[PDB]
Amino acid sequence: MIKGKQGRFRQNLLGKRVDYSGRSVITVGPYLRLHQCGLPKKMALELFKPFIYGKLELRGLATTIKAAKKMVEREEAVVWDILDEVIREHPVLLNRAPTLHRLGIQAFEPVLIEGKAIQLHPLVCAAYNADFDGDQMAVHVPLTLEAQLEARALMMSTNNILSPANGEPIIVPSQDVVLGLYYMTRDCVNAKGEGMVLTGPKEAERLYRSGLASLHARVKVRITEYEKDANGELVAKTSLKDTTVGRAILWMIVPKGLPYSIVNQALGKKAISKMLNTCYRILGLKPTVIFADQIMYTGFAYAARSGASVGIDDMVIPEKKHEIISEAEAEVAEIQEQFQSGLVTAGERYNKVIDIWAAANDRVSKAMMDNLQTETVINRDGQEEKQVSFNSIYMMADSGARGSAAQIRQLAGMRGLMAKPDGSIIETPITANFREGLNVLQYFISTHGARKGLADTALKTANSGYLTRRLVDVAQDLVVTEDDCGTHEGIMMTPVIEGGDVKEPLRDRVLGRVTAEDVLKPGTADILVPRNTLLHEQWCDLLEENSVDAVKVRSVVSCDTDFGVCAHCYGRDLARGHIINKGEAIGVIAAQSIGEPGTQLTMRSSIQVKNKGSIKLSNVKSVVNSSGKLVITSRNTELKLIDEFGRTKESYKVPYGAVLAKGDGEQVAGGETVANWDPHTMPVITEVSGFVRFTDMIDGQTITRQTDELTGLSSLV
Amino acid sequence: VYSYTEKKRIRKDFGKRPQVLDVPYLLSIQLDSFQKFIEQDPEGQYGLEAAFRSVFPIQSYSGNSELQYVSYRLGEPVFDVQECQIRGVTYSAPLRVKLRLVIYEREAPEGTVKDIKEQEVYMGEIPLMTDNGTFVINGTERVIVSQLHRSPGVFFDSDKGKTHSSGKVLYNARIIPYRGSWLDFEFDPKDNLFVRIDRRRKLPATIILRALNYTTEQILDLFFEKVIFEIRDNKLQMELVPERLRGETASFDIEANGKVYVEKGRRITARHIRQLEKDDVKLIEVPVEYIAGKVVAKDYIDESTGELICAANMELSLDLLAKLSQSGHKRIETLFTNDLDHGPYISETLRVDPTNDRLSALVEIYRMMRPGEPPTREAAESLFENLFFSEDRYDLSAVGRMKFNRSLLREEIEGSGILSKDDIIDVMKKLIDIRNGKGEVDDIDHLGNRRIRSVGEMAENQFRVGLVRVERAVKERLSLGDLDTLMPQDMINAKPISAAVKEFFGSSQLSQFMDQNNPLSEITHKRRISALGPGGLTRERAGFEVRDVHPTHYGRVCPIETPEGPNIGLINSLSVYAQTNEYGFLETPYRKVTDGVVTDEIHYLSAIEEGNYVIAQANSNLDEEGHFVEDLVTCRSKGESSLFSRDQVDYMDVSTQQVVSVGASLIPFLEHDDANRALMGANMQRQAVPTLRADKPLVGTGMERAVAVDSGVTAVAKRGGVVQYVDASRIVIKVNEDEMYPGEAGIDIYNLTKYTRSNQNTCINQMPCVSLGEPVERGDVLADGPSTDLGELALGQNMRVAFMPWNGYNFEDSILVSERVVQEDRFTTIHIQELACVSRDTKLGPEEITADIPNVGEAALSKLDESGIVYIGAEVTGGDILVGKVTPKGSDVKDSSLRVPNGVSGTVIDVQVFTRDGVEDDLAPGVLKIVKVYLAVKRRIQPGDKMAGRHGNKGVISKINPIEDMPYDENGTPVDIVLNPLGVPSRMNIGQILETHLGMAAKGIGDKINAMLKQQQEVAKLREFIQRAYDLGADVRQKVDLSTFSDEEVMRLAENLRKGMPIATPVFDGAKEAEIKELLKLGDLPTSGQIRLYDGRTGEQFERPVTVGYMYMLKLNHLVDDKMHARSTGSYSLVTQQPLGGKAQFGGQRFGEMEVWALEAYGAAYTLQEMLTVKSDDVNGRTKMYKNIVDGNHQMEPGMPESFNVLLKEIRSLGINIELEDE
DNA sequence: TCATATTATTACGCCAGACAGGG
DNA sequence: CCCTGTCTGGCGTCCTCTCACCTATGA
RNA sequence: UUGAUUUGGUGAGAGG
């Protein structure tokens, strides 16, 4: 009765069943503002029975409590006004059933629904991982007054617009709205109203609505962008931008402070995400909430006006696809004719077949990708001119709404080389896509490849959940409890480099973390930033201008606070712009932010330089050989490639005894080989010269005589 | 030629490959298994006769009486199936067994018995199977699901990597009997051979050889070959066959015949072996360092002194050679222990063995098996001689002996059920051979190594359990038997057999409640192959490879119909053409291919036969003779799909449906969908509710007919003929004379099952689809069941669907529906609820059925009689009264009167009452007042329901728009349902678009026929257009013989086609795209499939024309007013003070653990405090809070949770003193 | 009805943690 | 006496919905 | 002072 998953701790004391709670199937309702959700009248009259009883007893309509329970059991004509007067400013906690991180419980204001389904604002769905394929959510009512204020001031859906795991906005517009924007702000080389001039964005929308221009038709407009270059003062600058009609119509919705160049591009999904991010960093919270709603409304409206279907003709088969398959069939015919005559080995045959089918797969993908990305060729006033296509599946791929390169590849080009459950690949690919028919064997190999994926997700989720449990029970205690621990120690944040191009820049690692000692400017001994400044975006831009090497920054593991973490050694709040407040539980949000992506994770010669810069060596003890190539007498030598500015751009590990084509502090060319060794032969190279003696080397007991067969130059083994 | 309901509406059948084998009867697994169980089959195999011939004749321990068997029988069921479902009894039959007791005198093995007696005794009742493959166990209709388990017979498994943490492989070998003790052999990383019995302790394996009366020398004779050292002129020369030197280093000087063959240092090559065989080299003189490591084979004793020189399996040293050389044993037999091939595993196991003779071997085995209790000669010998060698407690069946002889490459396949010495020795030899290198392991997912149990086998095993209990009872009564004063029912007892067989058919992991909401769902729950159950693997443990699809599933198990979630790939569903082998394996049809010409003869194969042959592909182009039109064709050799020549193949696939099952071969354009979305599509297609008006999929596959007939939901005519059609109650069919018996003049009267409850509260209802005075043939359908339309299979309905974003109302997967869908009642399904009321005599007198309902006023006496119980049929809702059922002394009187649950409406369709003999009948005792009331809610469609197509496109219907706001094309018709195009590039289920275009073309032909028949034309133009519609395109199978339809069957066909011409697009040989375009050109529709659509709101054109077509959309039984729930305050549990759980219990939401972590992640300290103290558990806190709310004071007085004090008392009820400290 | 008191299957996969064995 | 196979215990995802089934004995 | 039993526990199936 104590232990286990169903004891008292895990089943009745940590998790309890709860009154004033409800549950139903969700649906969309896109008319909502993002602080409110739809909630049915029947659930609203059941969850709010005591508030309705109190309201009915206040007016004087009834007397005893019984009378009120008969009134709402009968549901007379007067209790719905009582219900709209108990709802009004009273938030509710919506909760999707697998809550993984804190954005899966958010507080809304109810708007009453004729119906039996919770209407949930669409942007908020990307926080809940809630699609609408049969999902269900629970509603909880904050009873007391402190809980209503916590739902409005901490857990309201307008307050959760940044994910706590990072700095990325979580109210990013998901799928229909980015298609509506990508169709709206685009262009074509001829439309109605090509190259006419417009006195404002208002008559741009008036020309689109009356039927005199097109939504994408390039046009000089006169827009007035407000740049706030002073200290909190918005300065108007008006100019003529060569833009389209749709970019002016979308400029009618952008708030004042953002520049016009945030809408001047084509606006896929990454661009609209950084649009909302720059709006949040400049204009704050309230314009970003109202602008997120206006983005969603105009995306839905012009996606409705777009009529962006999907057909069978939209998946354009490459004309070059059949000749590519026949050239691959001729190549496997040559390899198997060598296999009948035994010239090549079996593993080299299998490797050659997988290599030519990978090459033919890449060529088929490039054929279809050219045939989709620039298929439209329309003339304007004369000879033809090409542009990016308005194919429907290509806008669904290029916009980033739904689709990638691989999925649009499998609908038009060949769907690769599927792998059997043995783990090794199958030498005969699936040359037929989905627009052509798969025959029987090809679909069966496909089912191998997809049954493995479904089994992996349905067994992966248990380990992901148990990982989140272990993480929030090791964290469980750690609360921000001071304001400064009073130290000078902290870890040394450098950009990380594996050996390719510089993977994660320093601005991703030292964004919003308080420096340990004051960072010297890279010239000489300057106080560039002081020693306890939070590094927000302005400081990080003044770090990127000066090309700062690495920052000694304060880390949580170096915090000197007994029983908790001080407010500076944590860093930025991450979903609030400022430092972490005294109190906010960081262990639980950290454990959730590590364990929450557990589902997306999977479950089951020499050095060639790439760029062109300067050489530097670390952990090096070296010697010049007879020929001149600086060989190394240390195993653990790090070969860095430093640029002309001071930051470290490349790093490699060079073994004991390697032939370096270059030396210390030298300038090289891009692509020149600078290192060489033999890993199958461990070098026993020296420091000095002289003659060689065999000390304790006796043939017969110590060493042996193995004269070489095919060469004759013997060696004492 | 066609039958007469085939000429009603003949579906346009694409499909190029001529089918050679028609689809077998889809319920044949269940029916053939249970027809094997009950059948009078002489020669004994298989059935109930096998059980009676195993258990009988019973003779007691020399008690001079021997009860023997004659014959058995099953009488009539006392209750036919309908009144059996109504009453609640099992649908069973009494098992009348003739038993003949003969009783001996003293000294009669051969003497004639002194007296006989014989009677038709009664043991148990066995549940018969309904004609559709179901049981009726206790009123409810259940299905036994066929198991998939490991075959009996030896398996050589490896476990190559994980043990020893050193990369050293092991090799174990399990001899799995069908009934009895498990025997496993296994290596250990010291390269020693170990036996274990029934997963017990580990014994070194040669002790079992020493238990079979084998001395050490006989064991070394078995597992080792002898090397002969002859004592000769000098240094004790060696016989050397040159095979033994293969791959080793020459340690000494290899010379003979005055010639140095191979010197020291170089390894012996096979050319040197050829030199020694050409030079005829056997006897060579060895150094003394060569014998100084070898091991003796047999024993040798010093002859004159009379003592032992060396025991068998002893390594040799030089002084041991000085011992044995001087005695006079000239031959020395040594064990050839090759480090490469012939390893010394048995010999080192003999060195591990602490035993020496047979008796100590049996004592050690008895101390392993049964510990504590002493090991004496009789007890240990009886144990080991009945472990494997008696016919009672160890029995490899015929399957087990076939697999056991097949895995050891024996010639025969039939043998005795027990093991022997030679079988255990052969398993050890094959295991050693696998360790040496020759031969390989077996895999467990290979469906030649994986048998199917079915209903007859499982019920026969349970019946054999009951019979061995009743024979132990008969042996009990007979030795205490006094004669002649007993007749054979004081000996025998009907109780244990009935108890065991009702234990299996009631409470087992495979006798389970039938998914009955759909003809598809019935017919695909009966064809189910579960890996679970008794003796099989579990859901929460294993694994990765048994959840995965293996290349022997091609044509035996559906690759794509397996339920997603916790059990994927354990609950496999059987393929369309796959029968079951004689031994229980899965054999699938193939077409025998002797030479170039592919012959139309079929031939069935299992996976241990499919590997040897080369089997072609279903769709490989062959023209007019069977010759493959290419010179190379894709086949598969040994589970490897590869390209072979024109003339090498021995078999071809029969038809191209045969890979998948009957759930996922109803999906048209399957080959264009992804595998994941075909899985989700088939699993949702099982879940469809039957609509009120069944509607004929325009894009089907033609397998709708076989599923709708073979699942017994339609009233298929038994004997052909005409009709009398009284039908209000029953279809009356007059029989044609050729099918009519000479006596029993006879006309067939079919019973239509009208509105009644299914197992999933849906409505199963049959409607006659034949008129009066109309010819029907044998096998034709007469009454359309639930979800059927003229014998086809109509799960959902076909609706006009536009693919576009429409103002956000179809955002993620939502679906936006017109009002024309909800006005026409074209999804308004009918649900039926059974509600029981009983008035049991709990305590303080019996309860009572009277209208004189108390406290409650004239709001009780209303939908009832003048004095009790709901009248018959009104529009009852929630909070009404159905059966007044309240007691006095329970003012102190109360209201238990079964009412209507909260939120439901309906019409009382039926009231059953077999009550306590007095209500003013046939039922069991105990229960007194038994009133069952059948409501029938009619649920329409609403924002929040779930619809889905056949391709995996799920959706929660979001907005129910008016007709005006819909996107209308320029012809004027609104579109019915708007889906979302963004699902289609990601979820790669592109088949729904081809279904959309081809359904658009189907309704294009239907609109064209509706114009030609409404604006009425004489039938020449209709038969010309129908002939053009049925020719249409490439080489197909259908064409039609349309000029023989008598100028009226053209018109009745064209009356049944004016809603759209139905098109069969088969599974993998479906309609190509050019035929879709060509059919869209026959109708007057645009070729692209896309029409320009205007907007109903703004009246102005959508740019970039959108896709409109007809998709067959289904309503799944996840309805929103079965999920909507809310709770403010009501009842809680007993032990804890927290609220109850569920909806049927009016309970609240479990605010689980991760939600508490999410509130801790915010600063919600007060929200969490009321979330676990006031709202949930603390009783003083929640009563003070309810009074504080209704006063108008939102403030909580928290206190301590009650379940924590429950924790304190449960911890404190140990020896633990947990407290609560200082203030 | 009112006290009497427990036996003839096996088929997870790591991963720590404690224990007798032996160079 | 320090490595070492070997054995024994202790984990293994949250939320929800539907249905059926429940110890023998006994003067 | 104006009324009542599932949670308990197993098995099977389903949804996200």
Ligand SMILES: [Mg+2]
């Ligand atoms: Mg979903």
Ligand SMILES: [Zn+2]
């Ligand atoms: Zn600190």
